[PDB]
């Protein structure tokens, strides 16, 4: 028996089946052959790494140029100089991810846009001090972008978003949350310039129905996130579901004006709707009844924190919906828990989700290693 007789591909696969700790502290110290095998690299994940590298970033940048994805998650140690030199040493970068790096300024993203145009995925956590000038740099240099995420970046106006929308025609994903100073103009410039868009979200933004209605030009929309958005009437989302036939996931949480008639229209004209979220929507059992009687494709429906939901609506939606597998009955105080228990006992393949039910699931997962 000799492991070294196996080809190096099989040994690399076996070492890839090993965790990082077991590979760097045990596998790399067995022999020089295993050392050279485990030393071989591409995609690197440095997620929060106990914030233990500032200069090691420049060391690994000067070491190898064959990096296609960099994960810089939460990363409180290093400064913009390390990111700049890493961008200088990695032109062939495809995916960039750095969440909650609130110490990075826009010079880092400027150097990134200037020294890696092949970017496809750019995921940028809160990261305050992100002006539109480095964002227009990114928009005008990284034309090959596909995925873009700017979550809770309060320092972004509409200029950078419109510049991003002008270029980067291959943008399939976009997500923005709680980003003020971003209004219907950015949504309109994004909807009419990038027909490749599939995933879009403007949660908590200063967007109204005038900007949401422009999303009908995107017949390739798959998921839509419109949570806590300013005054979105029923007719706009009606037209959205009618035109965008490829819509699979619709998120309308924290919208106090969506009624049950809108839910009925969406369920009727939603031939490809798979996930619908209606948390805090001022609706009643009629919405669930319509979803059950008219929609043969909705699998996930969430009506959490809806005041007027009762036992009858959930029983009828469990009886009439054939594709339903997850019911979001969270904090529906007008719903009896014994009814939910009867439902989970006499309705399989449906995960009724209430407060007590999720607490019970977590308590069973804990009792698997139980205590007192």
């Amino acid at each position: 028996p000799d492991i070294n007789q196996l080809p190096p591909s099989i040994l690399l696969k076996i070492f890839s089946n090993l965790s990082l700790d077991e590979r760097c502290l045990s596998a790399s110290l067995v022999c020089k052959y295993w050392r050279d095998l485990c030393l071989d690299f591409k995609q690197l994940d440095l997620s929060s790494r106990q914030q233990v590298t500032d200069e090691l970033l420049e060391k690994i940048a000067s070491r190898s140029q064959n990096i296609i994805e960099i994960n810089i998650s939460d990363c409180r140690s290093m400064s913009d100089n390390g990111v700049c030199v890493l961008a200088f040493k990695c032109p062939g970068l495809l995916r960039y991810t750095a969440y909650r790096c609130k110490q990075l300024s826009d010079t880092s993203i400027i150097a990134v846009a200037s020294h890696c145009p092949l970017l496809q995925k750019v995921h940028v956590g809160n990261q305050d001090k992100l002006t539109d000038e480095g964002l227009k740099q990114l928009g005008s240099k990284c034309r090959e972008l596909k995925d873009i995420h700017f979550g809770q970046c309060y320092k972004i106006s509409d200029e950078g978003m419109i510049v991003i929308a002008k270029g980067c025609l291959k943008l399939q994903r976009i997500y923005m949350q709680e980003n003020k100073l971003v209004t219907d103009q950015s949504v309109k410039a994004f909807a009419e310039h990038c027909p490749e868009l599939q995933y879009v979200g403007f949660m908590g933004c200063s967007v109204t129905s005038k900007g949401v209605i422009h999303l009908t030009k995107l017949r390739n929309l798959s998921s839509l996130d419109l949570r806590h958005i300013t005054e979105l009437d029923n007719e706009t989302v009606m037209e959205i579901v009618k035109r965008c036939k490829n819509l699979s996931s619709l998120n309308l949480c924290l919208n106090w004006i969506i009624n049950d008639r809108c839910v009925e229209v969406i369920a009727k004209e939603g031939q490809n709707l798979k996930e619908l979220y209606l948390v805090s929507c001022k609706i009643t059992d009629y919405a669930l009844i319509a979803i059950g009687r008219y929609s043969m494709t909705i699998e996930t429906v969430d009506v959490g924190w809806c005041k007027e939901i009762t036992d009858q609506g959930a029983t009828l939606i469990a009886q009439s919906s054939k594709s339903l597998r997850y019911l979001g009955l969270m904090r529906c105080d007008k719903v009896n828990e014994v009814t939910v228990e009867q439902l989970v006992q006499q309705y399989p393949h449906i995960t009724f989700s209430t407060v007590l039910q999720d607490c019970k699931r977590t308590l069973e997962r804990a009792y698997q290693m139980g205590w007192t």
């Binding site: 196996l6 099989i10 089946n17 596998a27 110290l29």
Partner: protein, 154 residues
């Protein structure tokens, strides 16, 4: 459906066409070879797999004939029970099964055997890995110290 394979040592095994189609290499050589009329079902020689390992692979593919293949997912310790009971062999047989799964291009058997070897590696110091795998420590006390220094961030 029937296909007759020949091993490296001279034994012949006649099995189902689809079970051999589990092996990408075997189905590729069949589609290239026998799309037209078969020539009296001439034997297919496998000179890189002997008889016992070929029989083990045939048994594994016979048990795994209904698995639906959905390539790049997360790593876990599923390793179904029957695969574990089947891989309860010595190191030589396991390495020969690894070589056969890499030669016959059987992704499932390759994954299961690689996970078994990795679990055999898991939870063992370098000295224990060298003892269980018969690998001489070619590291000097200097080089081993440099290697453990370069990976201090763990």
């Amino acid at each position: 459906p029937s296909i007759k394979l020949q091993s490296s040592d001279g034994e012949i095994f006649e099995v189902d066409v689809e079970i051999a189609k589990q092996s990408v290499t075997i189905k590729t050589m069949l589609e290239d070879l026998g799309m037209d009329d078969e020539g009296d079902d001439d034997p297919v020689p496998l000179p890189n797999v002997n008889a016992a390992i070929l029989k083990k692979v045939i048994q594994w593919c016979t048990h795994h004939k209904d698995d639906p293949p959905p390539n790049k997912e997360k790593r876990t310790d599923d390793i179904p029970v029957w695969d574990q009971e089947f891989l309860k062999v010595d190191q030589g047989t396991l390495f020969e099964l690894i070589l056969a799964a890499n030669y016959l291009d059987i992704k499932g058997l390759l994954d299961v055997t690689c996970k078994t070897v990795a679990n055999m590696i898991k939870g063992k110091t370098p000295e224990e890995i060298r003892k269980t795998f018969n690998i001489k420590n070619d590291f000097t006390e200097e080089e081993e110290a440099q290697v453990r220094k370069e990976n201090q961030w763990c």
